[PDB]
Amino acid sequence: EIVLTQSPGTLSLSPGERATLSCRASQSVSSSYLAWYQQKPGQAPRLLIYGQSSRTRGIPDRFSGSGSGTDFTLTISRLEPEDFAVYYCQQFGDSQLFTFGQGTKLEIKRTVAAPSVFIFPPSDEQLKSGTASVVCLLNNFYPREAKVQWKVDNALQSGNSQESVTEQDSKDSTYSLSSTLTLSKADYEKHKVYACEVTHQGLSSPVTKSFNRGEC
Amino acid sequence: EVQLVQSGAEVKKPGESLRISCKGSGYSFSTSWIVWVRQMPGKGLEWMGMIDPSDSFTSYSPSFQGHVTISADKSISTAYLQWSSLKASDTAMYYCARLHYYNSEEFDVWGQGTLVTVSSASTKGPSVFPLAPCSRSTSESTAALGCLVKDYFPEPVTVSWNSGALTSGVHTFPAVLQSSGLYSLSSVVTVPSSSLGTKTYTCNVDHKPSNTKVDKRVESKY
Amino acid sequence: KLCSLDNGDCDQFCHEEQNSVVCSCARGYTLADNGKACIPTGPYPCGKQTLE
Amino acid sequence: IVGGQECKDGECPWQALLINEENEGFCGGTILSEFYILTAAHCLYQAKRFKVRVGDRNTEQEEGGEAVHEVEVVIKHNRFTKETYDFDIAVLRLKTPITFRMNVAPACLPERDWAESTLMTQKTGIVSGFGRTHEKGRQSTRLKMLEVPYVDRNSCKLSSSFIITQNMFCAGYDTKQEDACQGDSGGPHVTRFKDTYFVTGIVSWGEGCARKGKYGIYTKVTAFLKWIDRSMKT
Ligand SMILES: [Ca+2]
Numbered sequence: 001e002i003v004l005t006q007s008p009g010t011l012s013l014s015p016g017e018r019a020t021l022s023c024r025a026s027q028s029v030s031s032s033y034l035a036w037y038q039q040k041p042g043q044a045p046r047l048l049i050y051g052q053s054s055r056t057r058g059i060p061d062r063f064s065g066s067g068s069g070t071d072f073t074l075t076i077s078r079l080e081p082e083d084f085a086v087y088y089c090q091q092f093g094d095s096q097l098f099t100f101g102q103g104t105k106l107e108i109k110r111t112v113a114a115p116s117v118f119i120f121p122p123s124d125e126q127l128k129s130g131t132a133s134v135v136c137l138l139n140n141f142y143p144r145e146a147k148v149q150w151k152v153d154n155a156l157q158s159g160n161s162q163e164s165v166t167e168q169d170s171k172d173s174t175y176s177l178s179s180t181l182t183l184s185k186a187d188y189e190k191h192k193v194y195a196c197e198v199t200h201q202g203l204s205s206p207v208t209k210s211f212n213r214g215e216c
Numbered sequence: 217e218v219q220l221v222q223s224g225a226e227v228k229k230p231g232e233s234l235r236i237s238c239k240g241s242g243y244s245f246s247t248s249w250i251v252w253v254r255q256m257p258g259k260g261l262e263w264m265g266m267i268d269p270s271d272s273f274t275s276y277s278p279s280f281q282g283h284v285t286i287s288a289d290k291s292i293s294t295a296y297l298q299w300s301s302l303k304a305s306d307t308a309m310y311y312c313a314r315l316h317y318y319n320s321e322e323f324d325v326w327g328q329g330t331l332v333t334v335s336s337a338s339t340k341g342p343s344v345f346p347l348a349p350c351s352r353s354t355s356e357s358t359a360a361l362g363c364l365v366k367d368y369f370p371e372p373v374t375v376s377w378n379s380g381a382l383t384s385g386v387h388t389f390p391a392v393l394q395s396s397g398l399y400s401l402s403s404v405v406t407v408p409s410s411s412l413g414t415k416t417y418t419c420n421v422d423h424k425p426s427n428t429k430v431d432k433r434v435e436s437k438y
Numbered sequence: 439k440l441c442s443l444d445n446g447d448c449d450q451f452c453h454e455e456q457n458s459v460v461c462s463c464a465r466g467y468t469l470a471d472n473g474k475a476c477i478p479t480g481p482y483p484c485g486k487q488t489l490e
Numbered sequence: 491i492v493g494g495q496e497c498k499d500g501e502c503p504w505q506a507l508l509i510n511e512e513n514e515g516f517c518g519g520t521i522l523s524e525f526y527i528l529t530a531a532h533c534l535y536q537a538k539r540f541k542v543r544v545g546d547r548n549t550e551q552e553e554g555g556e557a558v559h560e561v562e563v564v565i566k567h568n569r570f571t572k573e574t575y576d577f578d579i580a581v582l583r584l585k586t587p588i589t590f591r592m593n594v595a596p597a598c599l600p601e602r603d604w605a606e607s608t609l610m611t612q613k614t615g616i617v618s619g620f621g622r623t624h625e626k627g628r629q630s631t632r633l634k635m636l637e638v639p640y641v642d643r644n645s646c647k648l649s650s651s652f653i654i655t656q657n658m659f660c661a662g663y664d665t666k667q668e669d670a671c672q673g674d675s676g677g678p679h680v681t682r683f684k685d686t687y688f689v690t691g692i693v694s695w696g697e698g699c700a701r702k703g704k705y706g707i708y709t710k711v712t713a714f715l716k717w718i719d720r721s722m723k724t
Contacts, residue, residue, distance in 0.1 A: 030562065032525065032587065035322035037261075044311055044326040045253075045261065051321065052524055052587065054479040057468045088261060092321040094563075094583065094724060097277065098251075098263040116406075118360045120347040126366075133364060135347055137404055139387070164389035164401065176387045178402050180364070182394075211350040218469075243460055244453040247601055249723075270716070275723070316465055317719050318599045319523040324468075441607075449684055451604045464598045464686075482590035484522075485598035485686035488500030 002026045002091050004034075006101035012109045012143070019076040021104050023089035027070040030093045036065065036074050037088045039103075041167060045088065049074070084108055084168075107144075110173035114202035115141035119209035121194065121216035132188035134181040136196035136209065140174035147199035148179040151210075152191045157181060188213065218242035218325055220250075220312050225331035227339075227370045227425070228302055235298040236330045238312030245293035246270040249315035251323060252286060252297050256308045266315055267295055302334045333370050337397040341428035342368035344421050347404065352436040354409040361434050362404035363419035367396070368426070375403040376420040412436075449476045491617065492624050492700040493668035494636030499547065502618045502635055503590075504597035504678055504687070506544055509558070510537040515549070515629070518619040518677020520689050521596045524587040526722065527561075530676035530692045530709060531570040531580040542584065544594040549620075549631045555593055560585040565721040567714075576655050578694040578709045581721050597680050598688040605712045608683060609690050614639045615661060615681040617693060617706070621674025625699035629673045636670065638662045638679070641705045649703060657713045659691060662706040670706050671699035679708050 007022045025031060035050035049055045049065050062077040076083060089101040115138035122132035138146055144165070150157035165177040179196070195210035223237045238250060246269050254262040265276035269288040276286070285298040295312060310330045313323035347362030365373055375388045385406035391399040403419055412435075421430040446452040446459030450467070453460050463469050463476035466483045470476065482488075497505070506519030506527050517533035519542060527542055545555040562585040567577040588594055600609055618635040622628060638661035641649075646660035654660070661679065662669050670677075670693050679691030691708030698704060711718075 030583075032321075044329055045313075045323075046326070047322055047324055051466075051480070052589075053481065054466060056324070056479065057477060090322065094722065097275070100261045100263070103260050116358075116360075118349065120360075120362065121350050123345045126343070126345045126364075129343070133345075133366065135362075135364060135402060137360060137362075139360070139404070139406070162392040162394070162400075164392050166387055166389065176389075176404075178389050178404075180392075180400070180402070216350040242455075243462055244455060244601075247451075247453065247462065273720075317601075318715075318722055319465055319526065445608060445684075450686065451601045452608070453601070453604065462601065464600070464688075482595045484504075484596040485680075485688055486595060487687070488503045488592050488595050490500070490592065 001096050002028055002031060002093055002099055004089055004091055004099050004101040006089055006104055008104060009102070010105045010107060012107050013079055014109045015079045015081055017079055019079060019106060021074045021087055023067075023072045023074075023101050025070050025072065025091055028093060028096065030095065031069070031091070032093075033068070034065075034072050035090045037090065038085050039088070040085045079106075107168050108173040110142050112202045113140060113142040113174050115139055115146065115198060115200055117196065117198045117207045117209050119194070119196045119211060121211050122188065127185055127188070130185045132183045132185060134183075134194050136179045136181075136198070138177045138198055138200070140169070140172065140176060141200055141202060142168075142174050143201055144168070144175050145201060146175075146177060148177070149197040149199070150179070150181045151193070151195040151197060152183075153193045154195075220314060220325055220327035222310075222312055222327040222330045225333070227333040227335075229336060230302055230304060230334060232302050233298070233300050234302060234332070235296050236310060236332065238295040238297075238327050240293045240295075240314070246290050248317065250288070250295040251313050251315050253311040253313055253323075254308050255311065259308075264297075269293075269295065304334045306332060307334045308332060335369065335397055337369040339425050340367065340369045340398065341423050341426035342366060342373060342421060342430070344419065344430045344432040346432065346434040347402065348434060348436045351438055352412060357409055359407050359409050359412060360404055361407060361417055362402055363421065363432050363434060364400070364402045365421055366400045367394075367398045368400070368423050369398050370425055371399055373401065374422040375401075377403075377405055378416075378418055379420060382417070446474075448474045491619055491621060491630070491634045491636045491670050491674055492627075493666075494634055497547070497618060497633050497635045500593050502633060503545075503593045503595035504680070505618055505633055506542050506677075507546055507620055508533060508537070508540050508676070509543050510540050515543070515546075515620045516673060517675050518621070518693060519582070520678035520680075520692070521588060521594060522599060522689070523596055524590065525584055527582040527584065528678075528689060528692065528711075528718070529580050529582060530578045530694055531566050532572070532575065532578055532694070533676040534564065534566055534580060535572070542582065544588050545591060547593065547633055555591050557588070557594075559588060567717070574653065574655075575658075575695045575707075577657055579692055579711075579714050579717075581718060597678060598686055599715065599718065600688040600690075600712070602712050602715045605688060605690065605715075609681040609688055610640065610659075610712065612640065612681050612683065615679050615690055616687070617661070617670050617674070617677070617679045617691075617708075619670065619674030619677040619693065621677070621693075622671040622699065625671060625701065627671070636668060638668075638706060646705060649705060650697065650707075654707065657710050658694065658707050659710045660705040661691070661708060662696075664705070665702045667700045669696060669700040671696075
């Protein structure tokens, strides 16, 4: 069995540039060459190129593959907006069957953009149902990396929140992310200051948005 | 046109059995091996096994042997994946794909995917709650509003704004699975601060599995 | 006829489905847009004498 | 081969040649892919350990593009037996991939039904090799080809002293002095359809070579396509 390790995990590039994706295989006692696939959100994987030098119909000549033994790459000479996606390498050995790499995300490198940050209190309607969800939104930021810290009366809350994040925006290449803090009404009712602190590459200092329990 | 077309999304509880199907058209089904591929939510592709539909010959990944069945009915050009006893960990997308014959090492044609959900949860409609700042003040020119769509099962919900008339600045987030086993998502919009006194903003929620349709007016007290 | 007449006009494999003709091609070929001709995926496809 | 012609350059590029310890050609093979060679099972008993030579076209002069590959795995048909020459087929997977060039290009595997109705219905196919040049003759130096009509199975059966199983077929001539011979065994019999050459048979056996009233006997490949497929997937 051959384990395939692709690299990098995320590749950040600009339309127009050349991309190089790696995949290294245990060239066992056999091995050979690899196939590669592209996958976009909500779609089935699509075979691009394969074997020693075969190409699927319709693949532009900007796509090419190389390597041998344990070391293989796929190169894209000139990125199109339509070219940003996850890529998988795939091996077979006769005795060893099939294996895939862990995927590389091809994302659009755009200029750094700070998030807009917003905090929302739980609704009284929700509160009457026994739970308080407090939401922090980071809107249109780049790069993806962002830190969202919950504070209840300056106590950091860990393990009682969930995040959701958008894909790199297709128009402006930004991301958006929500963080939702969930408390029991009794626990919610035990505290005064509810705060969200966002740390981000585009933020020269961390930004805090807050409210006082019950004034909402 | 050669296609592989899979049956639709399934929602099941642990311990139930399940069979999903994969139909070939536009080529002779018997002449190509048919492979199954797993994609756990947010995870990568996993090869499970393959079948030669001419004689129903099968080979399973060791990681998957004994946990799944690959079968075929060549008279209707269909391949199948079956579990006698589901686990929550089977929750994933499953693809079929064609493996050629003598020397292929790759999958040329893929089905569209089948969504499989395994949960102790039962169908439940969402509650839709407003997202409004604690005080209408603004800082200054733009404001954010939203709806939190909480405690539903299974996916999906659809969300629109003002019956589709408001699309600019909307972000409807992917659901997260809560410790309760219920999903939750949030939809937000950026709006003119100058519009809050004149215009209504309503989020439109559909949860088809429960026949739930909600129009939630969002506005501040102050 | 169908596969009887010019091989259902497939270039290579011809198979009958749906009381109509379905072409395929050999490995290292892919079936053209027209459903019958076969296009090389590489520079040295099988069954082809080498030229210069 | 007895009679026929010589293969001009690049016209028989799927030809392989198995060579023993003494770097000498004793059986043919057919290139199926970058990694796989098709041959006759009985050639495996004609040498202790061997290698495969591609792109050779004359044993004396090096034409540049010849190249020799080590064999990594041998997949011999389980049911082959020496007394009947049934199941005379084996496949070799190499340690190194042959790299296609001018004069090394693989021959095509067909799909069984189409081949059996479209390829096996053609009047002739094409056999090749470096095997002997007459029945009790010398092994050939230059690579040769031969056009052999398919000989129908009934007339075939009637012409021969030994059983002709359905994993075999006849091709060649009654009285005419044209046939394959020893040393060609294992090499390619291909049939052309719309300018593509598919592997249809392996050189297996025959009563003498060119004998009057006797034809050449080939492993019927279509009868072994699925088995070939499975060997590539194990
Ligand atoms: Ca030479």
